[PDB]
Design an enzyme around this catalytic site. Structure first.
Site, PDB file in Angstrom:
ATOM      1  N   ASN A   1       3.159  62.904   7.263  1.00 46.70           N
ATOM      2  CA  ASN A   1       3.227  64.126   8.055  1.00 46.70           C
ATOM      3  C   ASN A   1       3.985  65.232   7.333  1.00 46.70           C
ATOM      4  O   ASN A   1       3.738  66.415   7.588  1.00 46.70           O
ATOM      5  CB  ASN A   1       3.875  63.843   9.411  1.00 46.70           C
ATOM      6  CG  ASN A   1       3.549  64.902  10.447  1.00 46.70           C
ATOM      7  OD1 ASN A   1       2.815  65.851  10.173  1.00 46.70           O
ATOM      8  ND2 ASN A   1       4.093  64.741  11.648  1.00 46.70           N
TER       9      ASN A   1
ATOM     10  N   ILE B   1       5.275  70.751   8.590  1.00 51.31           N
ATOM     11  CA  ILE B   1       5.351  69.644   9.534  1.00 51.31           C
ATOM     12  C   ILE B   1       4.379  69.889  10.677  1.00 51.31           C
ATOM     13  O   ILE B   1       4.192  71.031  11.115  1.00 51.31           O
ATOM     14  CB  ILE B   1       6.787  69.459  10.062  1.00 51.31           C
ATOM     15  CG1 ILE B   1       7.361  70.798  10.528  1.00 51.31           C
ATOM     16  CG2 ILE B   1       7.666  68.857   8.991  1.00 51.31           C
ATOM     17  CD1 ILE B   1       8.784  70.708  11.029  1.00 51.31           C
ATOM     18  N   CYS B   2       3.755  68.814  11.157  1.00 49.35           N
ATOM     19  CA  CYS B   2       2.783  68.878  12.248  1.00 49.35           C
ATOM     20  C   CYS B   2       3.259  67.964  13.374  1.00 49.35           C
ATOM     21  O   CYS B   2       3.318  66.742  13.208  1.00 49.35           O
ATOM     22  CB  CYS B   2       1.391  68.481  11.767  1.00 49.35           C
ATOM     23  SG  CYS B   2       0.193  68.210  13.093  1.00 49.35           S
ATOM     24  N   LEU B   3       3.599  68.558  14.515  1.00 51.82           N
ATOM     25  CA  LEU B   3       4.005  67.813  15.697  1.00 51.82           C
ATOM     26  C   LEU B   3       3.583  68.584  16.937  1.00 51.82           C
ATOM     27  O   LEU B   3       3.669  69.814  16.970  1.00 51.82           O
ATOM     28  CB  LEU B   3       5.519  67.566  15.715  1.00 51.82           C
ATOM     29  CG  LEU B   3       6.073  66.736  16.873  1.00 51.82           C
ATOM     30  CD1 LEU B   3       5.500  65.329  16.846  1.00 51.82           C
ATOM     31  CD2 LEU B   3       7.590  66.699  16.828  1.00 51.82           C
TER      32      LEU B   3
ATOM     33  N   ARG C   1       4.289  72.856  18.214  1.00 54.91           N
ATOM     34  CA  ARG C   1       3.354  73.958  18.413  1.00 54.91           C
ATOM     35  C   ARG C   1       2.414  73.744  19.593  1.00 54.91           C
ATOM     36  O   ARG C   1       2.060  74.704  20.286  1.00 54.91           O
ATOM     37  CB  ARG C   1       2.561  74.202  17.126  1.00 54.91           C
ATOM     38  CG  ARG C   1       1.644  73.066  16.708  1.00 54.91           C
ATOM     39  CD  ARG C   1       0.958  73.388  15.390  1.00 54.91           C
ATOM     40  NE  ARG C   1       0.065  72.322  14.955  1.00 54.91           N
ATOM     41  CZ  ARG C   1      -0.663  72.360  13.847  1.00 54.91           C
ATOM     42  NH1 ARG C   1      -0.628  73.402  13.033  1.00 54.91           N
ATOM     43  NH2 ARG C   1      -1.444  71.327  13.548  1.00 54.91           N
TER      44      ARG C   1
END
Ligand SMILES: [Zn+2]
Ligand SMILES: [Zn+2]
Lengths: 99, 108, 148, 94, 76, 85, 82, 99, 83, 109, 93
Positions: free
Chosen positions: C78, C85-87, C91
DNA sequence: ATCGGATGTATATATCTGACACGTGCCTGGAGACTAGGGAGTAATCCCCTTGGCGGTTAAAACGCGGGGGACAGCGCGTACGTGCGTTTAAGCGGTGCTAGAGCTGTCTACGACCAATTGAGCGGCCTCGGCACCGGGATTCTCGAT
DNA sequence: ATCGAGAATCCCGGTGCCGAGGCCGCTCAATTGGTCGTAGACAGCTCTAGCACCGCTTAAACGCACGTACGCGCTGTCCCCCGCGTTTTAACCGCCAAGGGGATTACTCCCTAGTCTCCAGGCACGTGTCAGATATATACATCCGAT
């Protein structure tokens, strides 16, 4: 001596029952025969997909139910409780379908 | 928004942005299609779908069912003030009609 | 501004109740800028490594998430090379009731177990999926060569 | 094999799971929802096309979509849809 | 001037120091009170890494501050 | 019976709550928080996180968003909070 | 050849439809008028459907044609594609 | 001694006269004031071309004429001669304008 | 420069004339209020779309073309005014 | 045809063919426009125009005039049956209505 | 100045072809312009939609033929179809 | 069934005026010739599905009868609305003044179309187990004849 | 006002089955990168007509009085749908069987967009003149009270 309901009190039962379910109210084969007859009148040697017949039946069912509801509204407006043809002609006249 | 992620996720939506863009471009609507139009269109479509689905699910729960059937869809659409106005002339297949008996007709 | 008092509450809560393995504060005089450090959990291959990251708070807050990015490099599907960062909390499903402490705890939980659903760096993701030992010792090498 | 056909089934299912966590949906309802999405999209796109032609322009910008939404839908749905679209485009830009 | 510092093992230890103490002095005191080599110790305040060159007062440190200790094990 | 001042504060503002709005989940919020989270957030209750769009549209048309009892209790027994703003 | 099939819409069917519509008491002349108006509706829809089938150089009127004829007439139908 | 027509005849004369001519039957100034009032309610500080006002007047008059014709038909259906608000309500209900 | 109760400008003789044009012989004493309400509703429903059209084009003056477009969208086409 | 005269004259029509062709091409109806479509469309437009014009002219000659005014067009459209169905939902400016009164409303004999 | 395009002189020519003696006023002339535009737009839109229906990309003559057959009522449809077929046959040679 | 007023409407004649039909300058869109390639016409093949038929079983349709409620015609009442007259009000027309905004023109820059490599999102096919359909027994509740 | 018998409807528990949800393999459209012609955003200018005001008619609106005919309630009659029982019919379900045409693919060819050049058909503007609107004075159809 056998139990008989007062005239009209079972019509309300039919109205309550038929406004709750969604099954088709017209038998399949007679409708298919009528549709095939009219199509053969327009063009000869035509074949029909079953889905097309079912869609036509659904559309006709909805149209007839709506027309009858409007006719009953007119009949109530006329200080009555029964529907007679002049109510249907008036309802189709106001909707602009005939003019 | 940060790049290196799919367009649908950049705006937080779920409907396919690229598919809507292709449909707008190749559908003979206009010579040129802006880059902000598909996002807006997908947002509106997704919002409308979610709005109708909420009411359909609520009706299905009220009917003690856990699978939405067209009857629940008709019950949700026709009992709403605005959705009925929008879908004025739309016939839902196997949807039935609302329960309604005129006041005069009831026994006295 | 209205967000200023809410940030005052956040900083007071952080001071009175410091988290475990995460410590954060304003690096500069400007209150909107922020920074944080996270230490790898014991039940993870990130032992002995500290991760530093910076946060930018929008002038319109708390209804909009702040921007969070690592400055250090680490081996994680991730985590991007530049720190992206992707969560979903960050978002997708950011909420007014959410707090910076809560998202830091979520980041710590992410460090405990990497997310294989939609990783940002997928090559190391399928490398981890191929075998656990490879990801283990590559993570140890990365955290002993740069993070240390 | 049969030619590939396009549909909105998966996205509708995702939205349903997002709204109701534990509610299924039959195939007939999938067909009805897909047709509804297609109809609304065609209405909005056609309205936007006509509006963008009426000002002697050539590009369908988000303003055209916003005005079409303000036209077709009733008042409250129009306001909510405009807010949602503005939020989506603002998030997409940055 | 009494302060607290917590380590990776979850134990909090008490430090009686002064705000003018250098970071190297703090690490020497920590080594004396714990036996841990200074090279394995890293000090973080609110995400700010501490360097032995500067002092405590450079970070605007007030009383009863709580600090975090990181063990830098040479090898893994 | 009467809510105390400590619990009278807004669940998000960390300050006094004015013009209470009650949601189907029985969550009370001030109009600024509610309106701002409608128009620039995920459009759901920040506490329970479920859609309230249908209820919001229903109650905005007829102006049924506010709860009279809690608002009047707060105004009568805690007036100088309102005097502050 | 097919002939005299409009009587296939029997009296109980029309009574049931009126009952669904919310009708309590039905007169005796309703049925013939209902059959006539139904025949009008079927003719008007089938004409458009068959024309759509003609244009495609085809020989079977699939449900798509019926759906699109209904959409043209202003009576949009869901559930059959489109 | 003064000569007065039977009640209803000059009404028929008016009907025959007004179905022959094509002018506008609503005074221009009050209608323009009403239109401007509605517009200022919607968006402040607007200006109107004269042709826009004329087109709005024509549309409104045509719609009202159609509605009154349908209302009279509905009222005649009820074995009456007058027109009453419930007739207007039913004629609007059937057309689907209010539902 | 606000305006008040301009719907009273729709005089009783005007509505009587409209009914006579429609082919009505005898009029009750309550038709006028209902007709006034209906006229208000019609003007709002048309003016909303007209103003939307004239605002989307960055103009401050509604034009007859805007009105005919709004009417055509609503479902009552009008001839004799362009477009 | 002769392939020497103007396209409208070559087709034997009076309505334009070039202008209709341009309108079809630039109007965003399809990517390509066939070479025979505008001829068909112009012919249909001219036929309908001639039909309405002839009815309007007869109606005007009935009323002892030399110019078709909107009232004449309104009468010609309404009196005919097919054209009334084709223009069912339209409204003509300065049009008026057909003169009719219900039979019940007439005085008793 | 920017010029406006209209079907005016064409309608006038048709009128003189049918009724050599009568004239036409301006308002009725604008009415006729609007009517011609309306019929053109309806026919062309239906043809374009129907062309998109069958996964085509061009509007040929038979497309307009089917659109005319669909829109106009019976007798008008038959007469218009015959007129268009005759016109295109005259044009093709 | 008229008959005489009395009213409104239709009809014949002068006139004058502004809108329609036509003449003219010109310029911008329409016509003519040539080229490229992709969209569509055509032939061949496969297999899905539509048409056709037979037997059973049974729920639905058809027919008849007793009657009670509802449709429909007639009478009386009085109140609301048509019809005419005098009075008050603002619509309608002309004339003038002012400017806000519609409309047109020149710059140019950034937004969107086009093309190639690529890869992961989304679709076709399989499979399984749980949600819903179904049946039997019982509890609950409108309904009507009789008090 | 009520009590009770008969009948329809709702709850509950057990059993079964088929279709909806998840998984796998795969192929093609969305993605990203880079380049380039042009659409419209902006500043500037012109000048049209939309708004505001004032004065003078007089036509339309208003208020009021009087009478009458039409809406409405009420009564009575009669007749025609309704509810129920019995008998006939064909709808529906499952089954099998055949081939017609929808759907796909490969091939080819010719129809149309695109470009350039050139020119005349339609548009804007200007001008003359008669069709129709207006005013005025007769002729006739129609209505209403009364025989
Ligand atoms: Zn708050
Ligand atoms: Zn909540």
């Amino acid at each position: 001596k056998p139990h008989r309901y007062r005239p009209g009190t079972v019509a309300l039962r039919e109205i309550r029952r038929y406004q709750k379910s969604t099954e088709l109210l017209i038998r399949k084969l007679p409708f298919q025969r009528l549709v095939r007859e009219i199509a053969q009148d327009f063009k000869t040697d035509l074949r029909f997909q079953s889905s097309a017949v079912m869609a036509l039946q659904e559309a006709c069912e909805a149209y007839l139910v709506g027309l009858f509801e409007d006719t009953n509204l007119c009949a109530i407006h006329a200080k009555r409780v029964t529907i007679m043809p002049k109510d249907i002609q008036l309802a189709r006249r106001i909707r602009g379908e005939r003019a | 928004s940060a790049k290196a992620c799919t367009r649908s996720s950049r705006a937080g939506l779920q409907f396919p942005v690229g598919r809507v863009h292709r449909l707008l471009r190749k559908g003979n609507y206009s010579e040129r299609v802006g880059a902000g139009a598909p996002v807006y269109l997908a947002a509106v479509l997704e919002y409308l779908t979610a709005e109708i689905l909420e009411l359909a699910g609520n009706a299905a729960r009220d009917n003690k069912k856990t699978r939405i059937i067209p009857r629940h869809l008709q019950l949700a659409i026709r009992n709403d003030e605005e959705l009925n106005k929008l879908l004025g002339r739309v016939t839902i297949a196997q949807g039935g009609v609302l329960p309604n008996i005129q006041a005069v007709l009831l026994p006295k | 501004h209205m967000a200023l008092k809410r940030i005052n509450k956040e900083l007071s809560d952080l001071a009175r109740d410091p988290p475990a393995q995460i410590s954060a504060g304003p690096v500069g005089d400007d209150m909107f800028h922020w920074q944080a450090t996270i230490m790898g959990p014991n039940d993870s291959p990130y032992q002995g490594g500290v991760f530093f990251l910076t946060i930018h708070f929008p002038t319109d807050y708390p209804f909009k998430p702040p921007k969070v990015a690592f400055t250090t490099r680490i081996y994680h599907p991730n985590i991007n090379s530049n720190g992206s960062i992707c969560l979903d909390i960050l978002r997708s499903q950011w909420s007014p009731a959410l707090t910076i402490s809560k998202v830091l705890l979520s980041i710590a939980s992410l460090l405990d177990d990497p997310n294989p659903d939609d990783p940002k760096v997928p090559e190391i993701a399928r490398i981890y999926k191929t075998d656990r030992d490879k990801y283990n010792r590559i993570s140890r090498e990365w955290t002993q060569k740069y993070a240390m | 094999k049969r030619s590939r056909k396009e549909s909105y089934s998966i996205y509708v299912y995702k939205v349903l799971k997002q709204v109701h966590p534990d509610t299924g949906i039959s195939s007939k309802a999938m067909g009805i929802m897909n047709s509804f999405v297609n109809d609304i999209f065609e209405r909005i796109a056609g309205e936007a096309s006509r509006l963008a032609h009426y000002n002697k322009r050539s590009t369908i910008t988000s303003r055209e979509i916003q005005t079409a939404v303000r036209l077709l839908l009733p008042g409250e749905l129009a306001k909510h849809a405009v807010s949602e679209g503005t939020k989506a485009v603002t998030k997409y830009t940055s | 001037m009494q302060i607290f510092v917590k380590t990776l093992t979850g134990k909090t230890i008490t430090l009686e120091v002064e705000p003018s103490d250098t970071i190297e002095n703090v690490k020497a005191k920590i080594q004396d009170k714990e036996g841990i080599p200074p090279d394995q110790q890293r000090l973080i305040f609110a995400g700010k890494q501490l360097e032995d060159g500067r002092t405590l007062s450079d970070y605007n440190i007030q009383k009863e501050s709580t600090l975090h200790l990181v063990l830098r094990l040479r090898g893994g | 019976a009467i809510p105390s001042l400590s619990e009278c504060q807004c669940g998000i503002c960390m300050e006094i709550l004015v013009e209470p709005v009650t949601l189907p989940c029985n969550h009370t919020l001030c109009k600024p928080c509610f309106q701002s989270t409608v128009e620039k957030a995920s459009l759901c209750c920040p506490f329970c996180r479920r859609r309230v769009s249908s209820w919001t549209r229903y109650h905005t048309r007829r102006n049924s968003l506010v709860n009279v009892e809690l608002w009047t209790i707060i105004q009568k027994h805690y007036p100088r909070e309102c005097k502050l703003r | 050849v097919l002939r005299d099939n409009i009587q296939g819409i029997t009296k109980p069917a029309i009574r049931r439809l009126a009952r669904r519509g919310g009708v309590k008491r039905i007169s005796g002349l309703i049925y013939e008028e209902t059959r006539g108006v139904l025949k009008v509706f079927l003719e008007n829809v089938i004409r458009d459907a068959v024309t759509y089938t003609e244009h495609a150089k085809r020989k079977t009127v699939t449900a798509m044609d019926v759906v699109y004829a209904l959409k043209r007439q202003g009576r949009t139908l869901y559930g059959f594609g489109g």
